[PDB]
C-alpha cells in the first residue's frame, strides 16, 4: 500500500518555527507531487501548497507564501513542511497528501494529519480518574474515565488496550483556563464487569505520558 | 485565483434515501485539450483524514461505493449519493485542480433516524480525585436521537449551574445516534456538605425527564 506517515502532535511557541515530516512508502516518491492541506478545528480544508520531489519545484496558495516552506529529501522519501513566525491562527491539523500530477490531478492518498497547537501555555500531563457506578435494572453496565487538566490536545483514550472497541464514546475536550478536560465512556455487559478487568488507557503524546486506570467497583 | 462554492452547507436524510449536493466554480474547470474537468470530490468522516471519492468530475476512485456519483461540467458540479447509508456521515468537499487547488467550504451530511431515548448513567467522584481536594460528579447520556437534549443538575433538590461542563459527540457512524457527557465539578468540602446528587435529562422523546441519582452514603 501507498502510505504517508506524518509525525506526532506538536506544541510550539508563538513567533517560532515548526517543521513536520511526511514519510512516503509503497510507491515511486519521485513520480508524484506531495500536497499539504490545513484544517482548523471545526473548519473546512484549505490548500497550502505542493512540492514535486523529483525537482524540488514548489507552488503555494498565495496566503501561505513566506509562512509555509516545503522541502523534500529524495534519499529518505520524506517531504517536510516548515511554518515560520507562527501565530495562534496556525493552530490546525496539517495533512500531507499524494497528488497524482499529470493525469488525475487529485489527492488520492492522505497522511493521518499532524495536530499543531500554537501557545505559550505549559505542557501539563493529565490527571486520570476512574468512573465506577445502585442499579436501574440494566443487563448492561456503563463505566468511564475522567481525563482532567492537561495541555495541549490531544489525548488518546483506549479501553483494554483497544480490545473493547464498540460501546465506547470518547467526548471532545473542552478548554478552560489553559487546561483541557475530557471523558470517555465504555458500555459492556454485566457479565464481563466486574468479573473481568476493564482498564482505560490514556496516552498524552505531548508530555510522553501514559496511564492505565483500572475501573474497580464501589 | 479560483473560488469554489458549495450548497447546501448542511443536509439531513434517512438511511436509504437519495441526496444531491451542488458545487460551483468561479471559472470553467474544463481543459479544451484532454477534455477533462479538473474537479474532485472528497469525503471526510469525523476524526479521519479526507478520502478521494471522484476525480475528473465523474470518475469514481478505486475503493468508492457505486452509490456515489459525480456529474456536471465547466462551472457547475453535482455529487449524488443514491441510497445513503449510516456510514456516509461526513463532510463532503469539492475541489478544483485546474489551476492550483481550491476547496469548497463543504457540505455536511447528517443522518435522520427514528427517535431514541438516552441511556443515562451517573457516576460519583473517585476516591483519588477526592484525595486531591476536588470532586467531579459525571453524567453520561448515551445513544439518543435527535441531538436536542437538555441536562439539569440537582443538589438536594435544588438546581445548580456553576461548575458544569458539557460535551457532545459527533453522530455515530453505525446507529446514527448522539451521546453527551455532563460533568459537575465542585470542591471536596462543597461535595461533602450535601448528599443527594441528581442529573436529569430532558429529551424530546417525552416531556417527563430521565432522572438518575445517588446518595453519598
Amino acid at each position: 500500500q501507498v502510505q504517508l506517515q506524518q509525525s506526532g502532535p506538536e506544541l510550539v511557541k508563538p513567533g517560532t518555527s515548526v517543521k513536520m515530516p511526511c514519510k512516503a512508502s509503497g510507491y515511486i516518491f519521485t513520480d508524484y507531487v506531495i500536497s499539504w492541506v490545513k484544517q482548523r478545528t471545526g473548519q473546512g480544508l484549505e490548500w497550502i501548497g505542493e512540492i514535486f520531489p523529483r525537482s524540488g519545484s514548489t507552488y503555494y496558495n498565495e496566503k501561505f507564501k513566506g509562512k509555509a516552506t516545503l522541502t523534500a529529501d529524495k534519499s529518505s522519501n520524506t517531504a517536510y513542511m516548515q511554518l515560520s513566525s507562527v501565530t495562534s491562527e496556525d493552530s490546525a491539523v496539517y495533512f500531507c497528501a499524494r497528488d497524482y500530477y499529470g493525469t488525475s490531478f487529485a489527492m488520492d492518498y492522505w497522511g493521518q494529519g499532524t495536530s499543531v497547537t500554537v501557545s505559550s501555555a505549559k505542557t501539563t500531563p493529565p490527571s486520570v480518574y476512574p468512573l465506577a457506578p445502585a442499579a436501574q435494572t440494566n443487563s448492561m453496565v456503563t463505566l468511564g474515565c475522567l481525563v482532567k487538566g492537561y495541555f495541549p490536545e490531544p489525548v488518546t483514550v483506549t479501553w483494554n488496550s483497544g480490545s473493547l472497541s464498540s460501546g465506547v464514546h470518547t467526548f471532545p475536550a473542552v478548554l478552560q483556563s489553559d487546561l483541557y478536560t475530557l471523558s470517555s465512556s465504555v458500555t459492556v455487559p454485566s457479565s464481563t464487569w466486574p468479573s473481568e478487568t476493564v482498564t482505560c488507557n490514556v496516552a498524552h503524546p505531548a508530555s510522553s505520558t501514559k496511564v492505565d486506570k483500572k475501573i474497580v467497583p464501589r | 485565483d479560483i473560488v469554489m462554492s458549495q450548497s447546501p452547507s448542511s443536509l439531513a436524510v434517512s438511511a436509504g434515501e437519495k441526496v444531491t449536493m451542488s458545487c460551483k466554480s468561479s471559472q470553467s474547470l474544463l481543459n479544451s485539450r484532454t477534455r477533462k474537468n479538473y474537479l474532485a470530490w472528497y469525503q471526510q468522516k469525523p476524526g479521519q483524514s479526507p478520502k478521494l471519492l471522484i476525480y475528473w468530475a465523474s470518475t469514481r476512485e478505486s475503493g468508492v461505493p457505486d452509490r456515489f456519483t459525480g456529474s456536471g461540467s465547466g462551472t457547475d458540479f453535482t455529487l449524488t449519493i443514491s441510497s445513503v447509508q449510516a456510514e456516509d456521515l461526513a463532510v463532503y468537499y469539492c475541489k478544483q485542480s485546474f489551476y492550483l487547488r481550491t476547496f469548497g467550504g463543504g457540505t455536511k451530511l447528517d443522518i435522520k433516524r427514528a427517535d431514541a431515548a438516552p441511556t443515562v448513567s451517573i457516576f460519583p467522584p473517585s476516591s483519588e480525585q477526592l484525595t486531591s481536594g476536588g470532586a467531579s460528579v459525571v453524567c453520561f447520556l448515551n445513544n439518543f436521537y435527535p441531538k436536542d437534549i437538555n441536562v439539569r443538575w440537582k443538589i438536594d433538590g435544588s438546581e445548580r449551574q456553576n461548575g458544569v461542563l458539557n460535551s457532545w459527540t459527533d453522530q455515530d457512524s453505525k446507529d446514527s445516534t448522539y451521546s453527551m457527557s455532563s460533568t459537575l465539578t465542585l470542591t471536596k468540602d462543597e461535595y461533602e456538605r450535601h448528599n443527594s446528587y441528581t442529573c436529569e435529562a430532558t429529551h424530546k422523546t417525552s416531556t417527563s425527564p430521565i432522572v438518575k441519582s445517588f446518595n453519598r452514603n
Binding site: 525537482s55 507552488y59 | 492550483l100
Partner: peptide, 7 residues
C-alpha cells in the same frame, strides 16, 4: 512542474 491540469 506546472500549477494544474489547465497548464
Amino acid at each position: 512542474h506546472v500549477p494544474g491540469g489547465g497548464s
